[model samples]
Target chain A: SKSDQFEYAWCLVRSKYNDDIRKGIVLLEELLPKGSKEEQRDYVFYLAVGNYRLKEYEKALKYVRGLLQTEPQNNQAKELERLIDKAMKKDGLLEVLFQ
Target chain B: SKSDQFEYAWCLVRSKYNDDIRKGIVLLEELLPKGSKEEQRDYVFYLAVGNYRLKEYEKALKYVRGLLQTEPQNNQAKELERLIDKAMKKDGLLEVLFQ
Candidate 1:
């Protein structure tokens, strides 16, 4: 059911959309169904980008962690890790102070 | 104090930082201080992009909403509105279900 939900949710993201949305939406859709490992990796990178843009940091972490899991040598995760930390910190502080 | 904090926080963000962070960090740092209309608009556009990259939905929404406030004709806010919708729905569902 979760996988199915991901599929359906992704379809809504992929359906005819605005230009900016299309950049992120279509990129993920195509990347998810790819055949090559390298291409799949690239897609994962962009998927992280879209998730970040979508404010789906947890989901973005999934794709980003995937990159690290598959390629332990990659340094990109460092930036993502920093971003996650910053976002979490900001969100936490906002919750206590602003809310 | 809040305004000062924002300025200080923004300055820290502006200081030499990692390449990826710099795009958003510097872009936002520059756009906020200019006392012009067009420059301010462009800055807000990139700020939205950086906030989007940073997975800062609320901050991004604030900037997007500002754009809408100043220019009703701008289409950029539409994508941001869609993103905010999707993010709020997902976060709400995840919170209620998981937490």
Candidate 2:
């Protein structure tokens, strides 16, 4: 069950990498608390990234902060936060244009 | 000369990958202005990573911010900043012990 869940989460995040972030976020949210610590961390990252791509920066940052609270040294979590923060600071017009 | 300088910078960053970060940072600073745009970006990343390894978090974030200013969407630059910020928030005792 655990491996199956991890495989599913992995597939979702992989889809996020392939630009299917909405799907990834849906699956990640449903499958939380299902994997190993590292896998769970990866799930959180994809959730943050998915929200980021959708321009839901505050939501993204919430997930980012959640991950960082759990693993303060997680480089991936920090990176996602940086991206979210930068996106939030940019003018809304530029943000849309840049996308 | 540009090619040689780039090759040298490449070698230094590669050394950072090999964990010889101090040497990498030294060369990166000296040759910062020599490389092409992308190569310059790479050099800044290594400099940030090197400072991170050395526990010079503020210096590392400075370079990360500089790169982000030029390329707001640079994923690598964001990642480096995340690492530096997390390191700074950690208790100094745990920080040293984690190394």
Candidate 3:
């Protein structure tokens, strides 16, 4: 069921309408705790991506941070965090919140 | 000059504004004939990415097709083409034209 569920989740994420990103994020979050370690990690990264696409930078950062905590050498996660941080700084939110 | 040009091209493609993707494509086309074969392939891949992101599916497909020719087993190019083909078919153009 996880396989079918994950396939559907991915289809939703990659769906035509941009709003499907929101729908897909929920599915990924639901699956986050339901899978094997790698699948959990996969779901986390997609959750991060869905949030990032939706411009929910803080939420996206949270997922990326958890990913880095799980795997410090995750360059993809790190790069995503960097982009999220960059977006936050551009919006003046990074300094107002983190600094 | 090639290094600086490429850095600028990559920067253009990565710029915050969407229109910069158009500007970046030209530089990659210029670099296409200038670089070593490996670097040219790199440029082609980025050209494919840039066009894909800009919704220029056919343009992206052409670049990926060239890339596939350079290395028939290139999974990245293959995957990119698959995405482009998917997009094209979804738009109903692939059936009318490429089909």
**Every candidate's lDDT:** 0.60, 0.70, 0.80
Write candidate 3's Cα lDDT for B6-88 as tens digits.
Answer: 76577567544566668778978888888897998899899988988888888888889988987999987888888888887
DockQ of every candidate: 0.02, 0.01, 0.02
Candidate with top lDDT is 3
- Per-residue alpha-carbon lDDT of model 2 for A1-99, expressed as tens digits? 555444444444433244445655776787777667877787788788777777788898988899899999888778878888888878476858957
Clashing pairs in 2: none
What range of 10 consecutive residues in model 3 chain B has the weakest lDDT sum?
B8-17
Each candidate's iRMS in angstroms? 16.8, 14.8, 12.0
In DockQ, how does model 1 score against the reference complex?
0.02
How well does candidate 3 match the true structure in TM-score terms? 0.46
lDDT of prediction 1: 0.60
Tell me the tens digit of each residue's lDDT in model 3 across A45-96.
8888878877798999999999899999999989989999888887886456
TM-score of chain B of 2: 0.72
Q: Candidate 3 — which pairs collide?
A: none
TM-score of 1: 0.38
Please list the residue runs of candidate 3 whose C-alpha ends up more than 4 Å from where it truly belongs after superposition: A93-99, B1-99
